Amino acid sequence: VNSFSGYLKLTDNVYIKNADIVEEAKKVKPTVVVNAANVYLKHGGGVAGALNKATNNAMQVESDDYIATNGPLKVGGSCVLSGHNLAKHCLHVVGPNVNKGEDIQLLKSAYENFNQHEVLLAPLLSAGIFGADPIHSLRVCVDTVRTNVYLAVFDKNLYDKLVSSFL
Numbered sequence: 369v370n371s372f373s374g375y376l377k378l379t380d381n382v383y384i385k386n387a388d389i390v391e392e393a394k395k396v397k398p399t400v401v402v403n404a405a406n407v408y409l410k411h412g413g414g415v416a417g418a419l420n421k422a423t424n425n426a427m428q429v430e431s432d433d434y435i436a437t438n439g440p441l442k443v444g445g446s447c448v449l450s451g452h453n454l455a456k457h458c459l460h461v462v463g464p465n466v467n468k469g470e471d472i473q474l475l476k477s478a479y480e481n482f483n484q485h486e487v488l489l490a491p492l493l494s495a496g497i498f499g500a501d502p503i504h505s506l507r508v509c510v511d512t513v514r515t516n517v518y519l520a521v522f523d524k525n526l527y528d529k530l531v532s533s534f535l
């Protein structure tokens with residue numbers, strides 16, 4: 369049993385809800401919240417800007433020190449950092465940004481990072497401001513992630529479309 373409430377069950381392991389991932393993290397304090405990161409961990413907007421704002425910029429301060437030490441992530445890669453006031457840990461995952469020309473085949477690699485964690489609160493990777501088709505992102509999630517994932521969809525309209533179109 370876990371703390372997640374009000375999710376629709378899509379599969380054995382994938383669950384979905386219309387929710388503000390920031391508000392959901394604050395309420396649940398999950399072991400892992402996923403950030404929709406970029407390779408530079410520059411948390412300007414979308415999920416990353418909202419998560420970082422909720423940490424009062426502590427996420428960006430930690431991220432800048434991580435990049436200064438390690439250099440940028442790979443598209444499709446991840447790193448584990450603090451979850452600050454939102455979660456135990458933040459898994460920063462870089463999905464391909466279609467609005468930068470990145471290969472959408474990298475979306476499967478991105479979601480494979482989730483399998484290193486038994487339970488996660490996450491957004492749909494490469495969805496929203498990253499420019500991918502969210503219906504596609506949900507299909508790759510379902511077909512890739514084997515661990516238990518709780519998906520927070522920001523757009524209420526999009527949530528209903530994702531549910532109503534799900535195979």
Ligand SMILES: O=C(O)COc1ccccc1
Pocket residue numbers: 491492495496497502520521522523524526527
């Ligand atoms: O709903 C999400 O989580 C990402 O996709 C969006 C679609 C429309 C507007 C904002 C986000």
